[PDB]
Design a protein around this ligand. Structure first.
Ligand SMILES: CCCCCCCCCCCCCCCCCC(=O)O[C@H](COC(=O)CCCCCCCCCCCCCCC)COP(=O)(O)OCC[N+](C)(C)C
Ligand SMILES: CCCCCCCCCCCCCCCCCC(=O)O[C@H](COC(=O)CCCCCCCCCCCCCCC)COP(=O)(O)OCC[N+](C)(C)C
Ligand SMILES: *[C@@H]1O[C@H](CO)[C@@H](O[C@@H]2O[C@H](CO)[C@@H](O[C@@H]3O[C@H](CO)[C@@H](O)[C@H](O)[C@@H]3O)[C@H](O)[C@H]2NC(C)=O)[C@H](O)[C@H]1NC(C)=O
Ligand SMILES: *[C@@H]1O[C@H](CO)[C@@H](O[C@@H]2O[C@H](CO)[C@@H](O[C@@H]3O[C@H](CO)[C@@H](O)[C@H](O)[C@@H]3O)[C@H](O)[C@H]2NC(C)=O)[C@H](O)[C@H]1NC(C)=O
Ligand SMILES: CC(C)=CCC/C(C)=C/CC/C(C)=C/CC/C(C)=C/Cc1c(C)c(O)c2ccccc2c1O
Ligand SMILES: *[C@@H]1O[C@H](CO)[C@@H](O[C@@H]2O[C@H](CO)[C@@H](O)[C@H](O)[C@H]2NC(C)=O)[C@H](O)[C@H]1NC(C)=O
Ligand SMILES: CC(C)CCC[C@@H](C)[C@H]1CC[C@H]2[C@@H]3CC=C4C[C@@H](O)CC[C@]4(C)[C@H]3CC[C@]12C
Ligand SMILES: *[C@@H]1O[C@H](CO)[C@@H](O)[C@H](O)[C@H]1NC(C)=O
Lengths: 27, 668
């Protein structure tokens, strides 16, 4: 639930990129 | 008349209301309508256990669970789990009755009511084909679809091989045309015509024949985008006229067959394939049955001519039924034309695109990419600050792009937090998004307490950040920069509004990280050292790793800058493991800890991937059928358990545990 200030402001955390098509049933 | 043979009617039939009503109730063959009814019911029966979500009801609607939900109306609530299973059972029975032709109208209602109740319970599950299924059920509820090939015909003599009104076919044909044409018009966006949406969809192996004569870029630009636009804009006209229906059938069938494999959209492509023959002659199935063997014909629907029906008007004064049918066919089609362009009365549902997703026929036009999300709260009494794990009490991620869902989420969080000793919380959101390869930017104002912020359905939302469309021309230069990078380097592009700052913690792994300015002016602060430095166009600055730094935008216009970093830790580990493997290989050749576990794990994963790739097609298909079989069996057993609990009563806890264990067993 709660996290640390260092984690909340970690912008360059790994990779974050997805197609994100709202038509496709994600799950 | 030429118009009579080309359009199927004449201008004289539109002279008066009586003539229009007479034309719309003209006797017609019921065979094609019956075939479509059967196919639609069959596909709905298949779809209920898979995408409507019957196999995950227990996980979704678990009793005594803290979840933030997104209904269209805040006063709409779900039922306990057993009653949810009952609702899904009624829906399944209705779909079966629609497919069979048994008690057609009652079955239509039994499918319709639960379907729309479930649809309106969750805004995050809306898409175009679910809305289309609802529309089709609503239309068929009022049609004479059980007049040709149905059990009702065997039960009642008056409904066996009887005529149907022409507006039955007219409404369905109009609905299909509206789907195609509105999709085609939505595909006129600049991003689509320029080839930005689905730019990488041409790498699929299905496009192999085209690549024998075109480059990858040319294939993606022409075939995918322009061919899709052309098909959308011309399919209805191609199917309507009978001099061009063969080419239209071929092209539409190929289109839908390819789409069924390129994407995962449930039964959408199969439903469109089944709807295509609705434009053919109404008596085509009967003609096909005409060419069947005499022994075979005994297992097939009647092949004689249809009998007269009271539904139609024959060369008499039309009654109430016919006038109501004509009024329906007019009003429904007018409303269907209007609705996809109604996003100017409901102003509270527009953020960057128009309205809620699902009822505008804009498929695959906009693609989003999220970089980061932060949630902050401040205690109303103590005043201490805290941070929440994004999406803590949610089952979907669609709340990040819509202001109504963000308001609902903030209200849910404010009601749930007090049970963790956080009183009267104020909540702030910070979401970074990029649409069709644009600069990453904030979508909501990060200084606004969403709990108390104002939202109304018919008023434009104040705390939504405008999309910076003046920076679109940068995409070519952005792609050049990205393609010029080394294989161990990464880049992030950001655009920030004046008067705002970005606070960033750089991980210790990200050694050798730097920032370069592209437009405007920014001030970078080293929090630990308390030092301020100002950058200019093209000026780059090295940033410390494992510390805080803040970027202030002091320009009067939005600024642009990019982050270039290398994962020092990963590079070092990779190099060490590579040397270790090479040395071991050399020793094995003849010459000459967590690292060893990582190396062996890599090899283990690679070996699994190799076996996965080298798999007989038959084995893969067999596993596919087994997975589908499991899904269906689990859904059935869970429904049986819930129905028993509803009827007889809840058994002992151990009995329930054993029953659930049996339901969760894999097939064969
Ligand atoms: C005062 C009262 C007047 C005010 C009313 C306002 C007037 C608005 C227009 C209302 C007219 C309704 C049309 C009813 C006629 C009708 O449904 O006929 C149907 C037409 O079916 C449709 O509704 C068409 C579906 C929409 C597709 C539109 C794409 C092509 C544009 C031209 C369509 C006309 C023809 O029946 P058919 O099977 O005998 O022949 C179809 C074509 N061939 C022959 C090639 C197979
Ligand atoms: C003339 C008019 C006719 C025009 C066209 C006809 C239209 C009718 C459609 C008939 C097609 C039947 C079902 C089609 C299959 C279907 O629904 O799709 C399938 C779904 O499969 C189904 O639901 C139906 C397949 C069988 C259902 C399984 C239940 C029982 C299994 C059968 C025997 C197994 C056990 C017995 C022996 C061991 C693809 O699923 P997916 O979306 O997960 O695929 C992932 C792969 N991608 C996304 C990339 C594509
Ligand atoms: C730079 O590369 C390092 C690896 O050299 C990255 O560290 C790895 O980060 C991933 C994603 O967070 C970790 O995966 C997840 O972490 C948990 C907890 O450690 C672990 O149980 C699972 O592996 C889980 O999927 C991964 O463990 C971690 N380390 C390794 C050896 O892969 C690092 O994240 C990269 N830099 C940045 C800023 O992302
Ligand atoms: C941190 O990572 C960045 C990004 O990988 C490194 O930048 C790289 O710097 C080298 C020079 O040190 C660039 O080499 C270039 O070679 C061409 C000729 O091929 C020459 O014309 C250029 O003037 C330049 O010397 C390299 O292109 C560049 N890479 C990228 C993707 O920008 C940086 O060196 C790293 N810093 C440390 C301390 O390792
Ligand atoms: C025959 C020859 C020589 C060339 C054919 C040239 C041709 C037509 C290529 C077509 C392959 C191709 C590039 C298909 C994707 C294009 C896109 C994004 C269509 C958007 C779209 C999607 C994704 C759907 O799922 C739909 C479902 C139902 C109804 C409409 C739908 C729809 O509009
Ligand atoms: C570096 O520059 C930034 C931007 O001017 C400073 O932020 C300002 O701080 C002053 C003093 O508290 C405020 O009056 C301004 O409103 C701030 N501007 C903002 C928040 O945009 C920052 O204090 C400077 N850092 C250091 C260490 O000198
Ligand atoms: C138990 C309750 C919630 C379920 C009752 C079913 C009601 C709400 C359903 C049944 C038929 C539905 C309608 C069917 C068709 C359309 C046309 C579409 O363009 C907009 C929605 C609209 C207008 C639907 C609204 C909701 C509706 C009226
Ligand atoms: C809530 O619990 C915290 C410790 O987790 C405690 O400090 C605080 O006083 C509690 N608040 C109330 C109102 O009991």
């Amino acid at each position: 639930l709660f996290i640390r200030r260092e984690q909340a402001n970690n912008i360059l955390a790994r990779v974050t990129r997805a197609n994100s098509f709202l038509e496709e049933m994600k799950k | 008349s030429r118009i009579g043979k080309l359009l199927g009617f004449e201008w004289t039939d539109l002279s008066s209301w009586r003539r229009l009503v007479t034309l719309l109730n003209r006797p017609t063959d019921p065979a094609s309508l019956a075939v479509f009814r059967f196919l639609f019911g069959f596909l709905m029966v298949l779809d209920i256990p898979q995408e409507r979500g019957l196999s995950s009801l227990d996980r979704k609607y678990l009793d005594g669970l803290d979840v933030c939900r997104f209904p269209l109306l805040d006063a709409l609530r779900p039922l306990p789990l057993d009653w949810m299973y009952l609702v899904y059972t009624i829906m399944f029975l209705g779909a079966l009755g629609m497919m069979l032709g048994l008690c057609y109208r009652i079955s239509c209602v039994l499918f319709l009511l639960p379907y729309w109740y479930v649809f309106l319970l969750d805004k995050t599950s809306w898409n175009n084909h679910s809305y289309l299924y609802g529309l089709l059920a609503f239309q068929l509820t009022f049609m004479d679809a059980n007049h040709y090939w149905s059990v009702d015909g065997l039960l009642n003599a008056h409904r066996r091989n009887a005529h149907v009104p022409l507006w039955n076919y007219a409404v369905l044909r109009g609905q299909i045309f509206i789907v195609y044409f509105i999709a085609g018009v939505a595909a006129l966006d600049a991003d689509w015509v320029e080839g930005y949406s689905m730019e990488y969809l041409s790498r699929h192996w299905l496009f192999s024949p085209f690549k024998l004569l075109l480059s990858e870029e040319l294939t993606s630009l022409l075939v995918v985008h322009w061919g899709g636009l052309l098909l959308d804009l011309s399919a209805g006209f191609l199917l309507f006229f009978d001099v061009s229906r063969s080419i239209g059938l071929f092209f539409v069938s190929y289109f839908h067959c390819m789409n069924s494999q390129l994407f995962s959209i449930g039964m959408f492509s199969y439903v469109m394939l089944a709807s295509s023959p609705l434009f053919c002659s109404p008596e085509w199935p009967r003609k096909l049955v005409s060419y069947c063997p005499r022994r075979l014909q005994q297992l097939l629907p009647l092949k004689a001519a249809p009998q007269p029906s009271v539904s139609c008007v024959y060369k008499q004064k039309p009654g109430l039924r016919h006038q109501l049918g004509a009024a329906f066919t007019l009003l429904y089609l007018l409303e269907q034309l209007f609705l996809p362009y109604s996003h100017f009365l409901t102003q509270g549902y527009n953020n960057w695109t128009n309205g809620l997703y699902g009822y505008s026929w804009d498929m695959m036009v906009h693609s989003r990419s999220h970089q980061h999300v932060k949630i902050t709260y401040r205690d109303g009494r103590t005043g201490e600050l805290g941070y929440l794990n994004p999406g803590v009490f949610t089952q979907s991620r669609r709340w990040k792009d819509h202001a109504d869902m963000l308001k609902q989420y903030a209200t849910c969080l404010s009601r749930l937090l007090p049970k963790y000793n956080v009183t009267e919380p104020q909540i702030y959101f910070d979401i970074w998004v990029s649409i069709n390869d644009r600069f990453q930017q904030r979508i909501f104002d990060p200084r606004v307490d969403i709990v108390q912020a104002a939202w109304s359905p018919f008023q434009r939302t104040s705390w939504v950040q405008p999309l910076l469309m003046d920076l679109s021309p940068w995409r070519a230069k952005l792609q050049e920069i990205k393609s010029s990078l080394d294989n161990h380097t990464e880049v992030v592009f950001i655009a920030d509004f004046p008067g705002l700052h970005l606070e960033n913690f750089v991980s210790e792994d990200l050694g050798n990280t730097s920032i370069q300015l592209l437009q405007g002016e920014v001030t970078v602060e080293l929090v630990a050292e308390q030092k301020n430095q100002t950058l200019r166009e093209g000026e780059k600055m090295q940033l410390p790793a494992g510390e805080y730094h803040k970027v202030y935008t002091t320009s009067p216009s939005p600024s642009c800058y990019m982050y270039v970093y290398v994962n020092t830790t990963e590079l070092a580990l990779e190099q060490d493991l590579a040397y270790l493997q090479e040395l071991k290989e050399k020793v094995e050749n003849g010459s000459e800890t967590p690292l060893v576990q990582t190396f062996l794990r890599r090899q283990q994963r690679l070996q699994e991937i190799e076996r996965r790739r080298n798999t007989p097609f038959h084995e893969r298909f067999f596993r596919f059928l087994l997975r589908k079989l499991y899904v269906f069996r689990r859904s059935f057993l869970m429904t049986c358990i819930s129905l028993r609990n509803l009827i007889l009563g809840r058994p002992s806890l151990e009995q329930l545990a054993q029953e659930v264990t049996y339901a969760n067993l894999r097939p064969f």
